[PDB]
Amino acid sequence: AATTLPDGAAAESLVESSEVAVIGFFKDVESDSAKQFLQAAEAIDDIPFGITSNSDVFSKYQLDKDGVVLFKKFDEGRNNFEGEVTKENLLDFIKHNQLPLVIEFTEQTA
């Protein structure tokens, strides 16, 4: 489930509340692009998912339009979801954000 962030004040405190946390920036949470977000968020419950359509949260990360990104303390610290917004894609972004690689196998392909 995703929480309701009032403004950028929560976007910064959220990432601090837990090591792994994500926050989307949808301009029309009542649209379809937002529906998939919550649905895909319902999959994981241990992660503090957050979502807001305010403007102070958008101008914060300089977002000319809507966009969903994740927030973590390790690795880079920020991400940038692309392609289209869909439950199948969201579950991939998350799993692709937190949890770094692993010393095992070597992707035998090339």
Swiss-Prot record:
Cellular localization per UniProt: Endoplasmic reticulum; Endoplasmic reticulum lumen; Melanosome; Cell membrane
Post-translational modification: It also promotes interaction with ERN1.
Parent-protein residues present: 136 to 245 of 508
Modified positions (N6-acetyllysine) in chain numbering: K65
Oligomeric form and interacting partners: Heterodimer; heterodimerizes with the protein microsomal triglyceride transfer MTTP. Homodimer. Monomers and homotetramers may also occur. Interacts with P4HA2, forming a heterotetramer consisting of 2 alpha subunits (P4HA2) and 2 beta (P4HB), where P4HB plays the role of a structural subunit; this tetramer catalyzes the formation of 4-hydroxyproline in collagen. Also constitutes the structural subunit of the microsomal triacylglycerol transfer protein MTTP in mammalian cells. Stabilizes both enzymes and retain them in the ER without contributing to the catalytic activity. Binds UBQLN1.
Lineage: Eukaryota, Metazoa, Chordata, Craniata, Vertebrata
Gene: P4HB
Protein name, as recorded: Protein disulfide-isomerase
Function: This multifunctional protein catalyzes the formation, breakage and rearrangement of disulfide bonds. At the cell surface, seems to act as a reductase that cleaves disulfide bonds of proteins attached to the cell. May therefore cause structural modifications of exofacial proteins. Inside the cell, seems to form/rearrange disulfide bonds of nascent proteins. At high concentrations and following phosphorylation by FAM20C, functions as a chaperone that inhibits aggregation of misfolded proteins. At low concentrations, facilitates aggregation (anti-chaperone activity).
Pathology linked to this chain's protein: Cole-Carpenter syndrome 1: A form of Cole-Carpenter syndrome, a disorder characterized by features of osteogenesis imperfecta such as bone deformities and severe bone fragility with frequent fractures, in association with craniosynostosis, ocular proptosis, hydrocephalus, growth failure and distinctive facial features. Craniofacial findings include marked frontal bossing, midface hypoplasia, and micrognathia. Despite the craniosynostosis and hydrocephalus, intellectual development is normal. CLCRP1 inheritance is autosomal dominant.
